[PDB]
Amino acid sequence: KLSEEQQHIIAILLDAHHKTYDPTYADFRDFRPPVRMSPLSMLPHLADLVSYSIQKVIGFAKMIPGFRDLTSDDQIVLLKSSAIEVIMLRSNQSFTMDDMSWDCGSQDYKYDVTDVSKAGHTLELIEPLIKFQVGLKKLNLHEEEHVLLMAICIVSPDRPGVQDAKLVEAIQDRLSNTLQTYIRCRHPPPGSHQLYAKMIQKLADLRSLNEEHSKQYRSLSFQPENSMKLTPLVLEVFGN
């Protein structure tokens, strides 16, 4: 039932993800170190982490079949609006529900509710972020459906600023069809439709987590003392 094109798309996205996600987390050692107490002691470390993650998201996105065919303007608006969502999404592979934290190789690089607050955020964001990660874990997604979800998140025609919405929608359609077909090859109805519905809802959830992170980011980065601790790529991508 998975056509030749669908297996091909899936193989591409899996290779793109394995080329942009290091499960050894070896590069976390080159970030500014985590300081667990300026009540924003984790801001330098987590800023470097976010900056690193943006670069990984751009590398993944470039390998999405069809993304190259978009204009440069549409590639930029898609990555600017999607980046925080793909970061939250891809971070689930490091999320461990033992202690509701993101385990990234060691005790130093393990981030819990209070580590994120030490970068300036409140439970207004973190509480829905943790439950999002837990709900994602419950779904028990194949890596195949995970990378398809990240790609569908990026190529969305409803992002503000998108020029060629129809092309973007045509690219998303082929990824959507590919994921729907992968589910149907794996799960019979009605369970197949219940899973696809739970994944769509997670994309809706990321939109509202996006809006809430952006409001807190705008408040945090408005203080020059916080802006100073960010990185140039974060200020460019998350700003103007």
Added chain:
Amino acid sequence: KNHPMLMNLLK
């Protein structure tokens, strides 16, 4: 353009 570093990472 406003995004030279992102443009660069897109090459």
